[PDB]
């Protein structure tokens, strides 16, 4: 009641400021923590009264950050699941909640070992004397990197995701574990894109089409490599994977202040001037060639058949 | 004497051959205050070229000239000894220094090329002070024609092809391709320029400076937003810095890659450049021929939290900022010269009609 | 107006004669008549009636070709554009091989000067001619090489993306040649060339010296718009080109750009 | 401890006139959005529990207000505290109220009621504490600034001023005015009392979020005559110490005049004051959501744009706006439930709600207030201000400075028609 | 020929300066080995007189290989020993003094003079209170206590075109100058300055035909914490030091 409320108002002004959680597995975390707290502090006659509950609690979390479609497409998760238990039982109070406990509870069983079955697989993709490129800073590809180097010698490119240096963190990870890292910019891509190898890089939302969203400028990354025949490497998650179609929607990328690309001490000429910062971008699907996530190795030929296993289509909506 | 300069840093594997120096030291801690080995105008040329206050391509070659018309004009002659030998065996350490110093534009190149062309036919029977005369007389000939009017004929054939209503796009800093905006802006085109602009030089501030006290519209952003912002831009105007035989562009290192996005995007690239800037040198790569930066520069502050503050420490750890690449010829459309406009096949075309053949 | 009437009696009385030819011959005609670069002058700036591009094109290669010597100048220059098109065949028809099928615009006298040149030389090929409609040109291209004795077959206009498989070699010829390599030509040379392009045919562009036209246009719209009058004209990319067919021999799209440069316009 | 902070939600400069005579000034929308709610917002994501709202001239508008605001919701966690009194007419009488009601406890926020700002304050606050801690209780009040350009068009010559301080422990040591001076003289006795390295900075905006201790309420109730913070701060460097934190990255600033106006309003549409951007929604009102799209394009519900009409760059347009055909607008900001008519312009102008524009105007850099109506082949030059329903008649051009409201003594018109007086 | 370095031999009431001060070894030995290590082939050298004239004999017990010994009047300073050897210099001035104990390294003050073209660059290390720029190189205003009836005054151009001014207090002249041939030809054009020390404050950057060549003339100095120079105002660290 108040404590649920109050926690609910502070997710939701958190997803509103910025990015809170700092990881998108602890974000995950907590999605799947307030969807339990939200049904195990409440009262419903029919499931479909439970799922317009959580229909409208989870379009107020979309209109909060509709950049962060992890909380969105967890919600459709979590209501697919809920939908299969009725479908179940159709063929109910207590039973039914139970079954959505231990079926919530069996998705953070899942959810825990995601990144550790990634880098279980991670052998199966890096060979000895190899040069890799990545963008931007994600835990799943340094781990898939911190793995791959632990039977393996070969080299990685970080470049920097430059709106703001968030891969020189990822850079200095690495190069604590000896990966022998190179750093350069966003202007070296595509000269230095004749000596990669692979590109493996991370997502923040895989879309319907099998297209993608994530750090900006890896759709450059994506055009080089499709120019240098070099095959790309997505190393993402099953909670990124969303059946937000591209140009259904708006609001596709997230704006933030223009004082990362150009400083408020600029001078007179910051009034004649239009600064724009997208930190992310769109990569289409035939800029890819395989995505990996806990499970196996998928191509992006194949993310609407997880789409219909993991997603059902009354749902997209939200 | 003159000794070279330490290499600073853990180099990259595939650029060992390749010189890293850094801005924090100098190599003239060594030498005299009366510069009597290298000349005073040629070690302020090489402090003014190593400290980064001289960055733009033309303005290299520029003061290039102007120092040389310093040192042709402290010039003496020896006994018994022909001005067109001496003076080719003195200025050799001279652009030595200039080498050890900061790595060498092909404009520079050539340059001295010219300047070694005509100094070499200097006849034996011209005085002193006569020869002095000609040679600053032809150094002031030659910057006069091959700077001011082939910007004014690149800028009336750039001119000619933008029309009304249309988006440019630029990058970098180089003078030709705002003093072509300008010159399009005064005679009454309407556009409006989206600057795109990369670290760790940041030089796109200069352009977006000079089209906002030029009174154009003005639009700046970054390489990532390049490619968000192609699919509305319709013109990409670019500085080359040199031309190569097969056709390929030199110039700033975020030059091949926002011509191949694009071209993905269906955007016709522009490269501006003067026909002395041309090489009968040719690479295929940013691998075998290239400028390396401080890797002290690629280091901000983003809060609190830099990180590669002390990236020495780490052993596995590698910097690097590239300068300059080169551009497949099929990537780049225009080369727009004071001769016309040309594609970029036509670069050895141009080397051999100005080649007097 | 006696200049277009000179003009139209020179292009009326023989129907496979050019117009830049009779434009050239009109301009000798008037320095026939200084006062006669005067009469030059004043019916180059009236002979604004023709919007093909190898007119102008002509025109503008006369008046640098001009400047008592201006009449025997013009004399020899229209005896190399006449004596031209034999050289075109020549160099052109010896890469026809047995047995090809043959990609063919609309109709041209020159692909018709190199296919009677082909069939001249004892070799068998069959021809697919796009019907290429915004009037029925295509056809009358189909009826002048059946009266040639060569298997043609009239082709739709939105089949040259059907018949682009079995079609091993593409020969067009264009209209007007700018500086990198690319031709002006009738609409359908553009989609014609990305599907041969496509299917890693080699593309042929079979025009005359006269054709070298100082423009360079990056898009569509960036030919002008006098030339275009649904548009008559397209631009083809000299990427999309494979070789070139002139008087001075069998060139590289790269070499036309070294042709105007030691022309200067 | 639990953060508190003091809202002064009247500044009592008469600046605003004969704007603020309808409503008050922190009710007055940047775009379709009050003062009071971007203040309030700033204090609630800075990270302070508890507010103090002291509303005085129009209070009972400010009440009726911002009751109705997220802010006064239960589930809200900064709670507000309503304060009305009709005696206090100054800046140190509301610090000497706050004083006398003991209302704080220890290291509350001083802001006013219209400050515009994203800036994590938890950093000075932090620094504040341990300033505090370490000279036991002697860090005064801690004045937070930017990083700026002496040039840049948000800052004013009435809102610009240098100061000179310690460039190691961070510590004002002047204060004074660059209004009418060209020439600044420092004292002498600036330097002995700080030797750690001192430095002069001109590039600070005063973003007027100095954060402070209860230790200024009591020397605001020691000393009658200070009236405001300016001559607080003046009497005490020129006699208890006050420092300084910078920042560098974070947008901060509070209106003063129309040009402080139009400036962070630019600010505002062009996102340099992130998160706080309107189409995140931050204030719960069901009809000020907007669709952000290229060129910081604000497309509200229900606009309906006419055939020809051109939205180039920072445009913002309110629920329920009604837009005409062959229409060009740029930089401005159009309230909700407009009526623009045909042919018309609009450059770098700010439009209320319940206008009702006609064709052929042409309207430039202006501002006008909420339920107007322009006649059409009207042509308002720049710095033009019209204030709550003012009809303007046709055929009639405007000058430069021209006021006009129906109030008769502060405007250049009266309640009469604008064709004929 | 780049620089050729002046020695003065004037004072500006602890010890005399020019024989006197002997604190491990002889005072004026020192600028000439600063001289004549960093080339300085040819050396001029000013007298003085104040000593009645006395500081010769001193004066010529260094053994340079190539000196230029001048006699000169009792009463002058610097700017009239600029003065009086103007018809003999050709190219830039580099002015030191003979009480002069430098340990820093002179070429980082000269490049401080080349690369940035200046017309002036001085050195200086930790009365006189120097405002310079946040980069530490360009010095901005300078002024002393005495001539200053109200505290100090700063114009607001400079403000524009300079937000933030790094202020010194405690630094000291080490009298190591870099003039341009124009310094020299405007203290002959205006021969009421006197004592160099007190031209440094007019020297019109600012808004105001004083200038021979926005467009103005570049002055420089470094301010060192590392490299001891000679010091007599606190004499603590001065007493306590180690001469290698």
């Not at chain 1, 979390?61 to 209501?79: I, Y």
Request: aromatic content about 8%; overall charge neutral.
């Amino acid at each position: 009641g108040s404590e649920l409320s109050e926690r609910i108002e502070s997710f939701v002004e958190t997803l509103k400021r910025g990015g809170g959680p700092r990881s998108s597995e602890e974000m995950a975390r907590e999605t799947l923590g307030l969807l339990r707290q939200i049904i195990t502090d409440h009262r419903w006659s029919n499931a479909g009264e439970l799922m317009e509950l959580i229909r409208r609690e989870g379009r107020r979390m979309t209109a909060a950050q509709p950049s962060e479609t992890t909380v969105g497409n967890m919600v459709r998760r979590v209501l697919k699941i809920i939908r299969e238990e009725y479908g179940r039982l159709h063929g109910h109070y207590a039973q039914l909640q139970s079954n959505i406990i231990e079926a919530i509870n069996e998705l953070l069983v899942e959810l825990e070992g995601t990144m550790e079955n990634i880098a279980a697989q991670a052998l199966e993709h890096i060979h000895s004397n190899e040069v890799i490129m990545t963008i931007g800073f994600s835990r799943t590809v340094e781990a898939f990197l911190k793995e791959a180097a632990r039977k393996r010698k070969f080299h990685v490119i970080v470049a920097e995701c430059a709106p703001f240096c968030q891969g020189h963190e990822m850079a200095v990870n690495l190069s604590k574990a000896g990966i022998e890292t190179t750093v350069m910019t966003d202007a070296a891509i595509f000269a230095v894109m004749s000596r990669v190898n692979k590109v493996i890089i991370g997502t923040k939302t895989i879309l319907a089409n099998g297209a993608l969203r994530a750090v900006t400028g890896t759709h450059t990354l994506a055009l080089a490599a499709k120019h240098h025949s070099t095959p790309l490497i997505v190393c993402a998650p099953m909670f990124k994977l969303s059946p937000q179609f591209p140009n259904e929607e708006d609001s596709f990328h997230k704006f933030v202040a223009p004082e990362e690309v150009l400083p408020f001490t600029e001078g007179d000429i910051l009034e004649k001037v239009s600064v724009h910062c997208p930190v992310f971008d769109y990569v289409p699907p035939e800029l890819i060639t395989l995505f990996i996530s806990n499970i196996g190795g998928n191509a992006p030929s194949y993310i609407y058949r997880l789409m219909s296993e993991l997603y059902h289509p009354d749902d997209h909506v939200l | 004497q003159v000794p070279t300069r330490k290499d600073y840093g853990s180099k990259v594997s595939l650029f060992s051959h390749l010189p890293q120096y850094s801005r924090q030291n100098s190599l003239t801690q060594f030498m005299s205050i009366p510069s009597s080995v290298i000349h005073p105008a040629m070690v302020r040329l090489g402090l003014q070229y190593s400290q980064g206050l001289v960055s733009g391509s033309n303005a290299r070659c520029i003061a290039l000239l102007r120092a040389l018309q310093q040192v042709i004009q402290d010039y003496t002659t020896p006994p018994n000894e022909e001005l067109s030998r001496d003076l080719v065996n003195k200025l050799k350490p001279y652009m030595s220094f200039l080498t050890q110093c900061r790595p060498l534009s092909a404009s520079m190149h050539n340059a001295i090329k010219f300047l070694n062309k005509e100094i070499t036919s200097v006849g034996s029977s011209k005085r002193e002070e006569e020869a002095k005369s000609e040679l600053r007389a032809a150094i002031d000939r030659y910057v006069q024609e091959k700077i001011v009017l082939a910007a004014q004929a690149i800028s009336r054939f750039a001119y000619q092809k933008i029309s009304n209503g249309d988006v440019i796009l630029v990058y970098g800093c180089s003078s030709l391709v705002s003093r072509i905006l300008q010159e399009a802006w005064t005679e009454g085109r309407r556009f409006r320029v989206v600057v795109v602009d990369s670290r760790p030089w940041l030089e796109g501030r200069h352009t977006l400076r000079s089209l906002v006290h030029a009174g154009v519209p003005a639009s700046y952003l970054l390489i990532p937003a390049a490619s968000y912002v192609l699919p509305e831009v319709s013109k990409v105007l670019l500085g080359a810095h040199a031309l190569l035989a097969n056709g390929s562009v030199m110039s700033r290192v975020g030059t091949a890659q926002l011509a191949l996005v694009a071209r993905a995007h269906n955007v016709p690239v522009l490269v501006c450049c003067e026909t002395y800037k041309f090489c009968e040198r040719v690479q295929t790569d940013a691998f075998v021929s290239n400028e390396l930066d401080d890797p002290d520069d690629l280091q901000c502050k983003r809060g609190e939290h830099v990180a590669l503050a002390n990236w020495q420490n780490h052993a596995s750890l590698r910097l690097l900022n590239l300068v300059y690449d080169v551009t497949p010829p099929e990537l780049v459309d225009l080369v727009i010269t004071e001769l016309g406009m040309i594609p970029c096949s036509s670069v050895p075309v141009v080397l051999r009609v100005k080649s007097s053949d | 107006k006696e200049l277009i009437e000179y003009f139209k009696s020179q292009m009326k009385e023989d129907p496979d004669m050019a117009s830049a030819v009779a434009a050239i011959r009109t301009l000798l005609e008037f320095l026939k008549r200084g006062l006669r670069a005067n009469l030059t002058s004043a019916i180059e700036t009236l002979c604004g009636v023709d919007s093909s591009v190898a007119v102008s094109s002509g025109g503008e290669l006369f008046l640098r070709f001009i400047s008592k010597i201006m009449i025997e100048r013009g004399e020899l220059f229209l005896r190399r554009i006449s004596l031209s098109r034999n050289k075109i065949a020549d160099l052109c028809h010896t890469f026809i091989k047995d047995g090809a099928t043959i990609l063919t615009h609309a109709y041209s006298r020159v692909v018709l000067r190199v296919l009677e040149a082909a069939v001249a030389a004892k070799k068998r090929f069959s021809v697919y001619v796009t019907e290429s409609q915004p009037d029925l040109s295509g056809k009358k291209m189909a009826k002048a090489l059946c009266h040639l004795n060569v298997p043609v077959t009239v082709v739709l206009d939105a089949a040259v993306g059907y018949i682009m498989e079995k079609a091993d070699l593409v020969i067009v010829g264009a209209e007007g040649v700018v500086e990198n390599g690319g031709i002006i030509n009738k609409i359908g040379t553009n989609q014609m060339a990305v599907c041969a392009k496509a299917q890693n045919k080699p593309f042929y562009v079979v025009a005359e010296s006269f054709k070298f036209v100082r423009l360079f246009p990056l898009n569509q719209q960036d030919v002008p718009d006098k030339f275009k009058y649904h548009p008559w004209v397209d631009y083809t990319a000299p990427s999309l080109i494979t070789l070139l067919f002139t008087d001075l021999g069998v060139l590289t799209p790269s070499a036309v750009s070294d042709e105007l440069i030691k022309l200067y316009l | 401890p639990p953060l508190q902070a003091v809202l002064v939600a009247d500044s009592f400069d008469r600046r605003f006139f004969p704007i603020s005579k309808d409503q008050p000034r922190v009710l007055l929308p940047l775009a379709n959005v009050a003062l009071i709610d971007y203040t309030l917002e700033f204090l609630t994501a800075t990270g302070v529990q508890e507010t103090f709202v002291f509303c005085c001239w129009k209070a009972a508008q400010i009440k009726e207000h911002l009751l109705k605001s997220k802010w006064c919701r239960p589930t809200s966690l900064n709670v507000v505290r309503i304060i009305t009194s009709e005696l206090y007419r100054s800046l140190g009488d509301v610090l000497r109220d706050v004083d006398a009601k003991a209302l704080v406890r220890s290291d509350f926020l001083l802001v006013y009621g219209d400050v515009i700002s994203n800036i994590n304050i938890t950093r000075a606050l932090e620094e504040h504490r341990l300033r505090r801690k370490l000279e036991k209780n002697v860090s005064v009040m801690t004045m937070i600034f930017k990083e700026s350009s002496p040039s840049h068009p948000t800052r004013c010559h009435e809102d610009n001023v240098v100061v000179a301080v310690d460039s190691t422990t961070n510590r004002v040591l002047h204060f004074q005015k660059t209004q009418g001076l060209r020439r600044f003289a420092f004292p002498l006795s600036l330097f002995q009392g700080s030797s750690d390295g001192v430095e002069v900075r001109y590039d600070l905006l005063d973003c007027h979020i100095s954060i402070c201790s209860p230790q200024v309420a009591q020397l605001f109730t020691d000393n009658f005559d200070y009236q405001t913070r300016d001559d607080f701060v003046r009497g005490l460097l020129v006699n208890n110490q006050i420092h300084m934190h910078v920042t560098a990255k974070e947008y901060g600033a509070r209106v003063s005049n129309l040009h402080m106006y139009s400036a962070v309003c630019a600010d505002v549409i062009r996102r340099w004051v992130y998160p706080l951007t309107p189409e995140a929604n931050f204030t719960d009102s069901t009809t000020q959501s907007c669709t952000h799209s290229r060129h910081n394009i604000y497309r509200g519900p229900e606009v309906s744009l006419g055939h020809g009409s051109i939205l180039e760059e920072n445009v913002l347009l309110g629920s329920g706006t009604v837009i005409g055909s062959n229409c060009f607008i740029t930089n401005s900001v159009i309230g909700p439930g407009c009526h623009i008519g045909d042919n018309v312009v609009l450059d770098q102008t700010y439009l209320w709600q319940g206008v009702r524009v006609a064709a052929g105007a042409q309207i430039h850099q202006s501002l006008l207030c909420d339920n107007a109506e322009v006649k059409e082949r009207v042509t308002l030059k720049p710095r033009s201000v019209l204030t709550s329903q003012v009809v303007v008649g046709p055929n009639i051009t405007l000058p430069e400075g021209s006021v006009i409201s129906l109030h008769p003594p502060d405007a250049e018109e009266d309640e009469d028609d604008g064709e004929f007086s | 020929m780049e620089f050729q370095a002046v020695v003065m031999a004037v004072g500006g009431s602890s010890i005399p300066k020019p024989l006197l001060p002997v604190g491990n070894k002889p005072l004026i030995w020192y600028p000439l080995n600063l001289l004549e290590r960093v080339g300085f082939e040819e050396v001029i050298v000013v007298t003085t007189r104040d000593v009645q004239k006395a500081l010769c004999a001193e004066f010529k017990m260094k053994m340079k290989p190539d000196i230029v010994c001048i006699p000169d009047d009792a009463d002058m300073g610097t700017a009239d020993s600029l003065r009086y050897i103007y018809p003999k210099l050709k190219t830039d001035v580099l002015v030191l003094s003979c009480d002069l104990i430098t340990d820093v390294a002179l070429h980082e003050v000269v490049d401080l003079f080349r690369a940035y073209d200046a017309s002036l660059a001085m050195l200086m290390r930790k009365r006189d209170f120097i405002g310079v720029d946040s980069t530490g190189k360009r010095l901005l205003f300078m002024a002393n206590e005495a001539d200053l009836d109200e505290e100090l005054v700063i114009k607001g151009s400079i403000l524009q075109k300079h937000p933030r001014i790094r202020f010194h207090t405690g630094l000291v002249d080490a009298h190591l100058y870099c003039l341009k041939k124009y310094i020299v030809d405007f203290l002959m054009e205006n021969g009421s300055i006197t004592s160099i020390r007190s031209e440094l404050i007019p020297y019109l950057v600012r808004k105001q035909s004083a200038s021979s060549q926005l467009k103005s003339l570049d002055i420089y100095s470094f301010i060192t914490l590392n490299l001891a120079p000679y010091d007599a105002c606190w004499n603590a660290c001065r007493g306590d030091r180690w001469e290698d």
